Amino acid sequence: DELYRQSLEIISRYLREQATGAKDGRSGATSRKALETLRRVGDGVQRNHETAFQGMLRKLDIKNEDDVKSLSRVMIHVFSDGVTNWGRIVTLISFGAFVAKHLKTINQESCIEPLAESITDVLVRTKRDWLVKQRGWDGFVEFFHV
Ligand SMILES: CC(C)CS(=O)(=O)NC(=O)c1ccc2c(c1)N(CC1CCC1)C[C@H](c1ccc(Cl)cc1Cl)O2
């Protein structure tokens, strides 16, 4: 599953670098651009909607691996409610980045990569055909061009 692998590489690297605060495959030229667009818009979403992120994180009260595992139910539910668009995908991944920052903070960084997997599973498995139509991460980068 190439679309899956690439999405996980992107989502994993963004989450990892955001938590660690230090930068780290196929279709890599696209992935570097996707990762570049993500740092830019993903960071914007996290700053401008920080109170909502803090509130959601707090309510979630993630303390361990079973709390991360529990995240997927809320994730699939609320992420699937609105109409499919890249802005919703950025909210999904961005909040993931937020959670990744929290995990590292509380010494649960080993849960980060699995978290990126939960996220990539929701994104790709529920929006697979839409992504295909949008030409994957090329559509992503295209949509946010500045
Ligand atoms: C009222 C408004 C929210 C409605 S809306 O239709 O505009 N909502 C969305 O578009 C949306 C899409 C994906 C989302 C979320 C929301 N949220 C909740 C958000 C984060 C601040 C509150 C986090 C969720 C998520 C992502 C990673 C991990 Cl690890 C866990 C979770 Cl629960 O992903």
77's tokens: 């539910």
CATH class of 1-144: mainly alpha
Q: Which of 45, 49, 91 to mutate to test the pocket of ligand 1 (most atoms within 8 A of CB)?
A: 91
Alpha-carbon distance of 130 to 146, in angstroms, equals 23
Nearest CA to ligand 1 atom 20: 53
Query: What's the full length of the chain, in residues?
Result: 146
Sequence-distant (≥ 6) Cβ neighbours of residue 9 within 8 angstroms: 25, 31
Q: Which of 68, 74, 95 to mutate to test the pocket of ligand 1 (most atoms within 8 A of CB)?
A: 95
The reported resolution of this PDB entry, expressed in Å, is: 1.7
Alpha-carbon distance of 94 to 118, in angstroms, equals 14
How was this one solved? X-ray
Alpha-carbon distance of 118 to 76, in angstroms, equals 10
